[PDB]
UniProtKB/Swiss-Prot annotation, chain B:
Active site: residue positions: 109
GO BP terms in the entry: 2'-deoxyribonucleotide biosynthetic process; deoxyribonucleoside triphosphate metabolic process; deoxyribonucleotide biosynthetic process; DNA repair; DNA synthesis involved in DNA repair; kidney development; mitochondrial DNA replication; negative regulation of intrinsic apoptotic signaling pathway by p53 class mediator
This protein's name: Ribonucleoside-diphosphate reductase subunit M2 B
Ranges that cross the membrane: none
Tissue: Widely expressed at a high level in skeletal muscle and at a weak level in thymus. Expressed in epithelial dysplasias and squamous cell carcinoma.
Domain of life: Eukaryota
Covered residues, full protein: 30 to 317 of 351
Cofactor note: Binds 2 iron ions per subunit.
Main subcellular location of this protein, as a coarse class: cytoplasm
Length: 279, 286
């Protein structure tokens, strides 16, 4: 415990400055710089684009949005608490605010593309009833809540949640951007994916200051495991084919993105998946 | 736990249309007052600081040391309790923005110490007072907050007390420096910070409203006055505001005037009946 700089009770500087971890602080300031609120996203032109979508297209989009809306207390409680380094706590405090902005944003999008209130709950009944939500909740137990959960495991899990889970949905929404549809959804999507990446990178940097890093095998387990989940969700459950994407290519993007994390965490690739997408 | 503020019945998937336009308004209001430390120019202060007297510098530096050591702990109370315990989405959003703001506050108090306190006369000797104020505070905050015996209702009040009152004295002390026209940076950031704490006090009072089981006005009163008592001991004994040319009797009054204003806000009766002694306390940005 005390053997860890990030957890060491002696890292809670007197107040703060002057900064001791310039790298961690730079990320905080970055976050601070990319601050934004839902209101900033213009949803004015969207409805005409929405109505130009085919029935199967509207089913896929309205569903992923709801899944986004479903996902959202790892950041709030554990890491903004266990880590003692002030620079890091400033970053987590900001990640909390932003996560809430993501939620307002998704609610806002659903609320305008789906006017009928009864349709909204017909939509969420299906959602909180599906596999991706449970298979993910269960995954969080085996790696975040369990007692044998070392701090290094949770840092890895954390980086997977931000970088591995939902990576496919961002890609799918990006895919629609190439077809030039729904400006407001696409704009908020890059804003949110940028934030997620920034969060994925932070978790990495946190991993990097670790004395007690878990085994590469243990890592590979959390990473690919979650890859499995993300993969079946977009291949089998909410087939990306529904919007004209290639079910197999998606399976490969997710794998590329996962290798990228592993290599970002210092380890070596395990899928050897090239990036299927050009965007 | 028949509390609508703590029941999971707190929304599911889609937060609109808003159920509590009440809290939501404050969240938007909070978002609208977003600011960062780098927006406060401290480049005219140092020369100002130098022209100050031994006691004024002693008073100012210590007040900042106390702000410093506190604002950053006032987050382990939000993060680990109010941001989680509460289920109403609207409130969760507000507490999230408060957490951020509180951090900007610590940055500012550090930037200020770091700019006025030349060398490590600060980390060494300045900060060995962490003084009965800091102590009686912990006790106060750990008997009405950190303890299990304490309900959620009491905590909200102990919350509004740490925000509305616990440092109301120092904000006042700095507005005094403004009256005197000293330390532009320090005084402007105090305007900004005090406006935030103000919003944060109001919020707790709004939460209290939604509570269904409010402790007894005899309990809501035991917390606030045990606060006033600590605050007053601090600014009239430990660091007499006389150091910057202020009237102690009057500062003891102002503190009381505020504590009352907090009581009325939580829908109760005054216990001092104290008038506001400082005419300069009618300002801009508040
Ligand atoms: Fe995130
Ligand atoms: Fe503060
Ligand atoms: Fe505050």
């Amino acid at each position: 415990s005390n053997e860890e700089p990030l957890l060491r009770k002696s890292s809670r500087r007197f107040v703060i400055f002057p900064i001791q971890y310039p790298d961690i602080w730079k990320m905080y300031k970055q976050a601070q710089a990319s601050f934004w609120t839902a209101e900033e996203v213009d949803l004015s032109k969207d409805l005409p684009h929405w109505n130009k979508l085919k029935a199967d297209e509207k089913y896929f989009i309205s569903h992923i949005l709801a899944f986004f809306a479903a996902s959202d207390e790892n950041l709030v409680e554990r890491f903004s608490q266990e880590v003692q380094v002030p620079e890091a706590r400033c970053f987590y405090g900001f990640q909390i605010l932003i996560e809430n902005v993501h939620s307002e944003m998704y609610s806002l999008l659903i609320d305008t593309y789906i006017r009928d209130p009864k349709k909204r709950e017909f939509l969420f009944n299906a959602i909180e009833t599906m596999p991706y939500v449970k298979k993910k909740a269960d995954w969080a137990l085996r790696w975040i809540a369990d007692r044998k959960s070392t701090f290094g495991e949770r840092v890895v899990a954390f980086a997977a949640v931000e970088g591995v889970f939902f990576s496919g949905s961002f890609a799918a929404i990006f895919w629609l951007k190439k077809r030039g549809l729904m400006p407001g959804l696409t704009f908020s999507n890059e804003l949110i994916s940028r934030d997620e990446g920034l969060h994925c990178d932070f978790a990495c940097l946190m991993f990097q200051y670790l004395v007690n890093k878990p085994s590469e095998e243990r890592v590979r387990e959390i990473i690919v495991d979650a890859v499995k989940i993300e993969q079946e969700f977009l291949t089998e459950a909410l087939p990306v084919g529904l919007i004209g994407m290639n079910c197999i290519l998606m399976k490969q993007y997710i794998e590329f993105v996962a290798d990228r994390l592993l290599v970002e965490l210092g380890f070596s690739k395990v899928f050897q998946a090239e990036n299927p997408f050009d965007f």
